[PDB]
Structure 1
Amino acid sequence: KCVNFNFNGLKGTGVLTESNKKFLPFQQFGRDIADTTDAVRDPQTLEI
């Protein structure tokens, strides 16, 4: 669903889908080719 985001103070609008890649456990978020957040770790449980 297209919804509004507030993720640990960072805001956006998009659709949450499951990441298939291998990520760092200490990673809060990550950036695309345009340096905007395309992926973010969930704060309560560990999922990106």
Structure 2
Amino acid sequence: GLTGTGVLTKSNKKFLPFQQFGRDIVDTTDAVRDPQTLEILDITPCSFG
């Protein structure tokens, strides 16, 4: 149900067993988990300028 766009890469975060996704200071989504692999993946915006 969480929609968006960006680049998905592996990160080193350590989520608790009841955590699903994390947010930064400005309350933007930067990390999610695979519902079928339970790994930690970071989200980065695509290039622009």
**How many positions carry a matched residue from both structures?**
39
**Structure 1: where are the runs of 5+ without partners?**
1-8
Identical positions, percent: 92
Which has the larger Rg? 2
TM score, norm. by length of structure 1: 0.68
RMSD: 1.1
Q: Following TM superposition, where does structure 1 have runs of at least 4 consecutive aligned residues deviating by more than 3 angstroms?
A: none
Tell me the CA shift for residue 23 of structure 1. 1.6
Pick 1 or 2: higher relative contact order, CA cutoff 8 A, min separation 6: 2
